[PDB]
Amino acid sequence: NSAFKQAIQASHKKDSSFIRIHKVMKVLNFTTKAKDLHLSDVFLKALNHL
Amino acid sequence: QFRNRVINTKSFGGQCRKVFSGDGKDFYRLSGNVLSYTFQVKINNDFNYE
Ligand SMILES: *[C@@H]1O[C@H](CO)[C@@H](O[C@@H]2O[C@H](CO)[C@@H](O)[C@H](O)[C@H]2NC(C)=O)[C@H](O)[C@H]1NC(C)=O
């Protein structure tokens, strides 16, 4: 007498997730006068030393 | 390694060079000679799971 039974089960699961954000906020803007600009004393010193 | 004090960073040169730190929300006196000192922030995060 010969009797044989086999059962095999396998499961494979894979998950991949990605996220990227690039968000840019402006809160202040400006424009300089064209003339008569008051230069920094360090800059004036540098120039006068030239 | 950082080493000992070499430059006098607090010779004000008879100037009253106030800067307002928007970070600390406080006024600081710069030296008369430093070219620039500014308080805008950068933050960098690197995070790894294995
Ligand atoms: C600063 O940004 C503003 C916003 O774009 C510039 O122009 C303004 O635009 C809005 C929306 O059209 C208007 O209501 C304003 O009248 C525009 N002028 C200002 C002065 O706000 C502006 O040109 C930029 N530069 C400066 C120096 O304000």
Curated annotation (Swiss-Prot), chain A:
Subcellular location per the Swiss-Prot or TrEMBL entry: Secreted; Target cell membrane
Domain of life: Eukaryota
List of glycosylated residues: N29
Changes after translation: All cysteine residues are assumed to be cross-linked to one another. Individual modules containing an even number of conserved cysteine residues are supposed to have disulfide linkages only within the same module.
Family to which this protein belongs: Belongs to the complement C6/C7/C8/C9 family.
Quaternary structure (record): Component of the membrane attack complex (MAC), composed of complement C5b, C6, C7, C8A, C8B, C8G and multiple copies of the pore-forming subunit C9.
Disorder this protein is connected to according to its UniProt record: Complement component 6 deficiency: A rare defect of the complement classical pathway associated with susceptibility to severe recurrent infections, predominantly by Neisseria gonorrhoeae or Neisseria meningitidis.
Function statement: Component of the membrane attack complex (MAC), a multiprotein complex activated by the complement cascade, which inserts into a target cell membrane and forms a pore, leading to target cell membrane rupture and cell lysis. The MAC is initiated by proteolytic cleavage of C5 into complement C5b in response to the classical, alternative, lectin and GZMK complement pathways. The complement pathways consist in a cascade of proteins that leads to phagocytosis and breakdown of pathogens and signaling that strengthens the adaptive immune system.
Record protein name field: Complement component C6
Encoding gene per record: C6
Portion of the full sequence shown: 296 to 345 of 934
Curated annotation (Swiss-Prot), chain B:
Pathology noted in the entry: Complement component 7 deficiency: A rare defect of the complement classical pathway associated with susceptibility to severe recurrent infections, predominantly by Neisseria gonorrhoeae or Neisseria meningitidis.
Gene it is expressed from: C7
Post-translational modification: C-, N- and O-glycosylated. O-glycosylated with core 1 or possibly core 8 glycans.
Subunit structure: Monomer or dimer; as a C5b-7 complex it can also form multimeric rosettes. Component of the membrane attack complex (MAC), composed of complement C5b, C6, C7, C8A, C8B, C8G and multiple copies of the pore-forming subunit C9.
Name of the protein in question: Complement component C7
Residues of the full protein shown: 150 to 199 of 843
Function statement: Component of the membrane attack complex (MAC), a multiprotein complex activated by the complement cascade, which inserts into a target cell membrane and forms a pore, leading to target cell membrane rupture and cell lysis. The MAC is initiated by proteolytic cleavage of C5 into complement C5b in response to the classical, alternative, lectin and GZMK complement pathways. The complement pathways consist in a cascade of proteins that leads to phagocytosis and breakdown of pathogens and signaling that strengthens the adaptive immune system. C7 serves as a membrane anchor.
Family per similarity comment: Belongs to the complement C6/C7/C8/C9 family.
Localization per record: Secreted; Target cell membrane
